């Protein structure tokens, strides 16, 4: 009879052929940045007093 025996073999490593194609992050607008506030502005001036003739 022939006894059971193992075929002594091993697997040689290979690097898989894998690639990553293009993609878009998907965002299209930013977030609003700004508030509509009243803002004070004054032209140069000099102040007098007005009197109406009676």
């Amino acid at each position: 009879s022939v006894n059971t025996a193992n075929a002594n073999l091993s697997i040689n490593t290979s690097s898989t052929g894998i690639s990553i194609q293009s993609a878009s992050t998907g965002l299209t607008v930013t977030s609003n940045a700004g508030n509509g506030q009243a803002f004070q502005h004054d032209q140069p001036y000099l102040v007098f007093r007005v009197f109406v003739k009676v």
Binding site: S10, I11, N12, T13, S14, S15, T16, I18, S19, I20, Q21, S22, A23, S24, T25, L27, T28, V29, T30, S31, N32, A33, G34, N35, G36, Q37, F39, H41, D42, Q43, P44, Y45, L46, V47, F48, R49, V50
Partner: protein
Amino acid sequence: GTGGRFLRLGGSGLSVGDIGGSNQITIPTNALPSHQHGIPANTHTHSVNDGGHG
């Protein structure tokens, strides 16, 4: 001195001869109106690294 200014009656809390104002105006930060910027189209890939696997 006139100072090349504008004529301003000063009834509300402004004595005679009072000056002020400015020809140069500076937009404050809170005065900026709310707005949204558009983000353009984008596209990218990531390289892949792998030495192999048995």
